[PDB]
Amino acid sequence: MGKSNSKLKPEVVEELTRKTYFTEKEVQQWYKGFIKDCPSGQLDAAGFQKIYKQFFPFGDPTKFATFVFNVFDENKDGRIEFSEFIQALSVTSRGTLDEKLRWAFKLYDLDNDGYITRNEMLDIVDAIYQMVGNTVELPEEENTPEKRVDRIFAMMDKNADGKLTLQEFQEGSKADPSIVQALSLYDGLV
Ligand SMILES: [Ca+2]
Ligand SMILES: [Ca+2]
Ligand SMILES: [Ca+2]
């Protein structure tokens, strides 16, 4: 009676914990955490930039933050929802290689209209480079493959397609690794 409208239902918590890579306490603290600030549970694009800023506070242009929100919103409604943030955040921790790879392509292309161009690849690389600049937690001295893709992909797009398409990206990513090596840090080889 009234209290039922507090905290998320336990049935979904159990099924959500089945897949989360995080513990139930971390999910409830996050849910109750921003829920108090926004009882609706729906965060605007700026809200997503704020939490992203916490993960990457050494950033500045924030262009990378809004860019993610632009292609990180499943409903593209201009706002991140509680189910999308908690579920998407869990995928960000370490979802299936296929799920994490999908998030990589969405971010790799700002308008991800199915075709990727080098200007978009360089623009996104600079976006994550500035966010990963300073020392928030950049990989090794500079694993971020910027010039590496310029030559590596330039070699793969010689076919003369005129553009870069997921057909070569996804097939090359599963055929010739390094093409999608995310600059993210890997917990281990297992
Ligand atoms: Ca949404
Ligand atoms: Ca595009
Ligand atoms: Ca091509």
mmCIF file of C-alpha atoms and ligand atoms in Angstrom, residues 42 73-81 84, ligand 1:
data_model
loop_
_atom_site.group_PDB
_atom_site.id
_atom_site.type_symbol
_atom_site.label_atom_id
_atom_site.label_comp_id
_atom_site.label_asym_id
_atom_site.label_seq_id
_atom_site.Cartn_x
_atom_site.Cartn_y
_atom_site.Cartn_z
ATOM 1 C CA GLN A 42 14.250 9.225 -16.671
ATOM 2 C CA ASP A 73 19.959 6.298 -26.524
ATOM 3 C CA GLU A 74 17.991 3.185 -27.563
ATOM 4 C CA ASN A 75 14.744 5.172 -27.975
ATOM 5 C CA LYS A 76 16.602 8.153 -29.463
ATOM 6 C CA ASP A 77 14.012 10.182 -27.521
ATOM 7 C CA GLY A 78 16.708 12.650 -26.416
ATOM 8 C CA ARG A 79 16.679 11.220 -22.866
ATOM 9 C CA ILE A 80 18.237 8.153 -21.178
ATOM 10 C CA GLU A 81 15.700 6.026 -19.228
ATOM 11 C CA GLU A 84 18.229 1.904 -20.400
HETATM 12 CA CA CA B 1 15.444 6.416 -24.088
#
